[PDB]
Structure 1
Amino acid sequence: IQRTPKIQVYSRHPAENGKSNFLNCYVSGFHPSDIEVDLLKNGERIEKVEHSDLSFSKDWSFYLLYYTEFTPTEKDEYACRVNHVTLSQPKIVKWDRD
């Protein structure tokens, strides 16, 4: 079985500048469980990145939340980069504010 991860990249709270927050990348629907997930600030990877304990759904596909604290501004772009066996190359999802 090989399942390709769905990905959402989002903030914990409605975002305002200068106002501290959490950036999330939720990966779900994947199999096997070996996976690389990196959050990016202006293309460069972020270091203080926590993630939840591995669990799975009714259909046996795994899911994980990666998160880190951050303060938005108008300049900084944020994204989630994901690699998994089912991908020919890393999948990058940009955080839009909606």
Structure 2
Amino acid sequence: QKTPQIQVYSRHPPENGKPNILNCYVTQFHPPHIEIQMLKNGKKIPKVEMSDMSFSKDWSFYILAHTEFTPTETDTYACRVKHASMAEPKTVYWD
């Protein structure tokens, strides 16, 4: 068993009111069965796109999630992951 690492980052420089893409890159996990949710103010974003599951030289899995978003001043965004290596879902916030 290997615990996932989660990194959250935007595709373009963030500008308030302008359409962008938010990425959630989940790596270093095993086994490959995993649940990824992207959150807007703590609510699940419904249209999240997922890359195919892949793995590295070191055998650990990675997968990219992404969604359209348009950041504002007052919106918080996160990526939350459920995996058998953690008793608790891990949440990483966009900075």
Classify the TM-score, shorter chain: over 0.9
- Hey, what does 2:53 align to over in structure 1? 54
1:47 deviates by 0.4
Unaligned 5+ segments in structure 1 are none
Q: TM-score by structure 1 length?
A: 0.95
Deviations 1:21-62 (A, max 9, x none): 001100001000000100000000010010001110001100
Equivalent position SS for 2:68: strand
Unaligned 5+ segments in structure 2 are none
How many pairs are equivalent?
95
- Hey, what does 1:68 align to over in structure 2? 67
- Hey, what does 1:87 align to over in structure 2? 86
The share of aligned pairs that are identical, in percent, is: 68
- Hey, what does 1:35 align to over in structure 2? 34
Over aligned residue pairs, what C-alpha RMSD do you find?
0.5
Q: TM-score by structure 2 length?
A: 0.98
Equivalent position SS for 1:73: coil
